[PDB]
Design a protein around this nucleic acid. Structure first.
Lengths: 469, 136, 314, 136
RNA sequence: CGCCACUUCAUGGAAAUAAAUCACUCACGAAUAG
């Protein structure tokens, strides 16, 4: 056969930039290159080059010398045009009372972009408002135009079609073999690594697909980690509630991984931090690295406890580390590169900002090396090893002080660029591990062999069942 | 349209002057595509867009792509050097300043047809002169 | 001027996209490196792009009605949402921010977006077995190419016309008659003026409740996954837009393995020796059905492997 | 432009010399079109652009199109020989060096009137002499 | 729970390639000489 007409199911909503069309669905611009890479990787039995030679011999390549592209036609079309449109933010806000049926809110999500659309601004989709009965418990209002002008919407549709056309039959047979694994392994969308890309294929050519998610995850990923989330009754009602629990749990766990949780009242240390301070106990935080020089001049930061040193115990040290010295590297770069760090000064009146750049303009990006896969309400955390190109590379930190003023006849103006004149530790303050030069000798596979085994009472912080490790 | 041998001579001299033809009479292979793309952009988009695109030096391209605009200016200067007094009353015979931006020169001088004809002449001359050489 | 692109009050879309696009305003800079990245240039190009994508086309538009009168009845299909892209390789960029970096195909006189008939001809022929020339750099690809295309076109022909058996020679003759209007081995056939397959320019015919043009992003993430991707802006034909495909097709007569004209086929039929097992016919209606099935299978335009320019029935 | 038999023999020798005619008296079929189109290119585009187009070796041509320029140079050189050398003769009986390409020679030596006539007659002789061989 | 952004905005390839390069007809006809 020359055509593959697959019907696939949506598990988690997709964040789509071109949502203004009712025909908005999966973009094959993401599927086709990733599917080509996956197919060639499977052809070479794990190696992309061997698979490229395989496709070269069988004449499946558009070009035999330049690129990875395979010769087939990808088409993704919606069968039923009804869409469930979601608003995705980072914080939790009161729900509106007047609300279209298509509109649901996944408030506590890893996707932290477009956080200002739930503000008091006139350009916010849901405008917050003071309550009259209680001078708390903010009120919610819905603006139709603002919801129409949003950059990105979380969309969920019914079963739709992905059509694969080629005149090469053997390529179609191998595509049929590997497509369920491809969709079970890859996520598509914005912040898709955190779970806004989850799809599974149900019917391939009008035939049901018995493809075990666990086995495919075991095959194509270095480590696969299952977490059984307590589905409190329901399971037949409020898929919105299910999504809220799932994404709040993901935000919980991933904030636990590379950072702490200074929220309500319970403190659990960053396991990314705890890994480096334990293995060869020299590498410490970039955050504590940053906060050290801010207090080197008079600038009191909000908080009651000093920055953490040591793996355990309730120790605090707003003082010298030790007579010898300490190792500082950009620990949080490997689990997702960041650019700008806000530090909350004691007075709300101003902020302090640290901004990061490659210091030679090489590493401007790093997608998180973790992938979150949610299939039929079960949470799986997967990942290969990190990219070693990020290891041992310096960075240049810009220290700025920013202040805001309360209206006075115009409005908010968070504009002060005093450009903090902190003394610098100096590049090459030590051998080239001082303040920069992302830490050498990291291992993601052993990082999660370490991450979810911690804390008193014996309960896993991330109550994950280790599947492949 | 017929390209004069004098125009080809000016193109050869300009290609050698703005370090495009090496001392071995060879040029990088990408410059032929550069010149063809410049001609296509000039006819399709216009003089201002094409000249702005190919005058850029922050372009991450595989070679010094502003060199064709430099060669263009050199050819036009050589063309304007041999203008007669009869031509100088109708045509702008002034020599284009070396440091001066070619796009800025075109814009400040309007969008006159004279500059468009000169640019097209020099582009075709660059094409032929590059064809005269070997591409290593 | 605003919606409802008409011959009375509307700017030429091609003129806006190519000529008026890079116009010099008193306080707009895109010559220097600072100007191209500034938000003033971004706002200028945003306003231009809004003007481009603020036009609608009515079903009863006099332009499309004139097209229907000139080119016969149209074959109306609908646009899926990748969008539709044609003339993508045309040079349109200056290095600025917020501008369309890709070319678009606009009719010069009308300004309506269109697909040149050459594109339709090439796309339709690309799934016929003899769309590849031997040359000598093709030699390796040629055998497999013809085989798969023969099987595909054979199933399509058995689908669309009441013929239960076709051959490779018959497929060759049919393809050459349809596209080259000749024989596979050079020499021509004395065809009538009507007996000639013409592929007109496909036109946008109806933007029902929205505009016909949209703006879209392709972001090629580099071969270095640690460097910043490139957002590329371009102009696409909106989904759910009626594209009129105009053809002038005839009825093809195949006796034995050769293509016959109507004048020859009349005498062949009247000959005392005849074989209905050797006389094959493909009606112009069945030819249009074949072309429609090909178009539904593969689509039209650029980035079709990515999906752009795929159709359903209207 | 009557058929000049001596130029026909020159064309035969030059066609054999620049590896166009095989040992069996056959040539690549595309060369017919090359010879036919060279004259039109010279007339309606100019001698230098036509020579540059046909002298290029970076072409996407089905055969070695640059061989015809070498044959042209050989015919021209043969005509420079057997020139009646006298004080009154306009014709320059100086042979074109093999290291110089044909485009450079006309560029450096700026008396095109002789070169144009010689190139036109040599192209006519080329086209007339190519017909003695099989058009494979 | 409260607050909040910075990024990135075209490169590489194809730049014409083949077919036909004149064909057929007329190439002197009458008158004046014998």
């Amino acid at each position: 056969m020359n055509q593959l007409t697959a019907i696939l199911k949506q598990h988690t909503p997709m964040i789509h930039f071109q949502h203004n069309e009712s025909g908005a669905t999966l973009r094959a611009s993401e599927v086709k290159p990733l599917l080509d890479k996956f197919i060639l990787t499977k052809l070479g039995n794990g190696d992309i080059r061997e698979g490229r030679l395989y496709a070269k011999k069988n004449n499946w390549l558009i070009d035999n010398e330049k690129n990875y592209a395979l010769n087939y036609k990808l088409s993704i079309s919606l069968q039923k045009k009804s869409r469930l449109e979601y608003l995705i933010t980072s914080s939790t806000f009161p729900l509106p009372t007047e609300r279209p049926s298509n509109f649901f809110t996944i408030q506590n999500s890893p996707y932290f972009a477009q956080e200002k659309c739930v503000g008091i601004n006139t350009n916010s989709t849901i405008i917050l408002k003071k309550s009259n009965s209680d001078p708390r418990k903010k009120e919610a209002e819905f603006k139709e135009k603002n919801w129409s002008q949003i950059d990105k919407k979380g969309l969920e549709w019914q079963d739709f079609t992905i059509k694969i056309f080629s005149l090469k039959g053997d390529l179609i047979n191998k595509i049929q073999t590997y497509l369920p694994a491809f969709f079970i392994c890859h996520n598509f969308g914005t912040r898709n690594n955190k779970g806004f890309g989850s799809f599974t294929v149900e019917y391939i050519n009008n035939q049901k697909n018995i493809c075990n998610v666990e086995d495919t995850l075991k095959e194509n990923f270095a480590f696969v980690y299952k977490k059984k989330i307590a589905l409190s009754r329901q399971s037949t009602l409020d898929f919105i509630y299910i999504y809220n629990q799932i994404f709040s749990t993901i935000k919980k766990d991933y904030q636990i991984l590379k950072s702490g949780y200074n929220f309500r009242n319970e403190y659990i240390k960053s396991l990314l931090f705890c890994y480096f301070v334990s293995k060869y106990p020299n590498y410490r935080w970039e955050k504590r690295k940053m906060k050290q020089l801010i207090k080197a001049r008079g600038y009191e930061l909000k908080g009651d406890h000093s920055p953490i040193s040591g793996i355990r115990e309730n120790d605090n040290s707003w003082n010298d580390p030790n007579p010898n010295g300490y190792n500082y590297a950009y620990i949080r770069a490997i689990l997702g590169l960041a650019e700008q760090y806000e530090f909350q000064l004691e007075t709300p009146y101003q902020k302090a900002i640290v901004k990061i750049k490659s210091a030679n303009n090489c590493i401007s990006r790093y997608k998180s090396p973790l992938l979150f896969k949610i299939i039929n309400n079960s949470i799986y955390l997967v990942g290969n090893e990190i990219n070693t190109e990020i290891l041992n590379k310096p960075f240049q930190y810009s220290y700025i002080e920013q202040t805001k003023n309360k209206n006075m006849r115009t409005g908010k103006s968070e504009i002060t660029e005093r450009t903090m004149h902190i003394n610098e530790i100096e590049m090459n303050y030590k051998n080239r591990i001082n303040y920069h030069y992302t830490p050498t000798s990291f291992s993601l596979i052993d990082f999660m062999q370490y991450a979810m085994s911690y804390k008193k009472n014996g309960k896993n912080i991330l109550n994950y069942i280790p599947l492949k490790q | 349209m017929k390209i004069s041998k004098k125009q080809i001579e000016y193109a050869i001299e300009a290609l050698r002057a703005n370090n495009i033809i090496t001392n071995d009479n060879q040029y990088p292979k990408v410059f032929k595509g550069y010149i063809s793309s410049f001609g296509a952009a000039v006819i399709q988009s216009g003089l201002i867009p094409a000249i702005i695109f190919f005058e850029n030096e922050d372009n991450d391209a595989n070679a010094d792509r502003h060199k064709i605009i430099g060669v263009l200016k050199d050819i036009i200067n050589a063309m304007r050097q041999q203008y007669t007094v009869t031509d100088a009353t109708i045509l702008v015979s002034s020599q284009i300043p070396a440091n001066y931006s070619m796009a800025q020169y075109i814009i400040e001088h309007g969008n006159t047809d004279q500059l468009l004809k000169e640019i097209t002449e020099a582009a075709v001359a660059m094409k032929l002169a590059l064809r005269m050489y070997k591409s290593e | 001027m605003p919606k409802n692109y008409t011959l009375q009050n509307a700017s030429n879309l091609g003129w806006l996209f190519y000529k008026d696009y890079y116009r010099q305003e008193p306080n707009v800079d895109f010559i220097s490196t600072q100007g191209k990245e500034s938000d003033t240039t971004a706002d200028f190009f945003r306003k231009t792009n809004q003007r481009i994508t603020a036009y609608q086309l009515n079903s009863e538009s006099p332009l499309v009605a004139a097209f229907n009168n000139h080119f016969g009845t149209p074959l109306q299909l609908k646009t899926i949402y990748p969008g539709l892209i044609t003339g993508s390789g045309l040079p349109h960029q200056t290095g600025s921010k917020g501008e369309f970096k890709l070319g678009f195909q606009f009719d010069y006189t009308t300004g309506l977006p269109y697909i040149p008939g050459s594109s339709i001809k090439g796309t339709l022929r690309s799934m016929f077995p003899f769309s590849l020339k031997d040359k000598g750099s093709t030699k390796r690809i040629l055998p497999e190419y013809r085989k798969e295309r023969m099987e595909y076109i054979r199933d399509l022909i058995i689908e669309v016309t009441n013929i239960n058996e076709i051959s490779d020679t018959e497929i060759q003759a049919l393809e050459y008659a349809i596209f080259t209007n000749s024989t596979p081995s050079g020499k021509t056939i004395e065809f009538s003026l009507e007996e000639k397959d013409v592929f007109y320019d496909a036109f946008v015919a109806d933007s029902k409740d929205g505009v016909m043009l949209s703006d879209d992003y392709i972001t090629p993430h580099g071969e270095n996954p640690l460097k910043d991707p490139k957002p590329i802006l371009f102009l696409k034909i909106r989904p759910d837009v009626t594209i009129n495909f105009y053809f002038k097709l005839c009825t093809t007569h195949l006796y034995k393995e050769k293509v016959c004209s109507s004048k020859q086929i009349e005498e062949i039929k009247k000959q005392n020796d005849f074989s209905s097992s050797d006389y094959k016919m493909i009606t112009a209606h069945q030819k249009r059905n074949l072309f429609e099935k090909i178009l539904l299978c593969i689509g039209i335009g650029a980035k079709t492997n990515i999906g752009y320019g795929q159709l359903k029935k209207l």
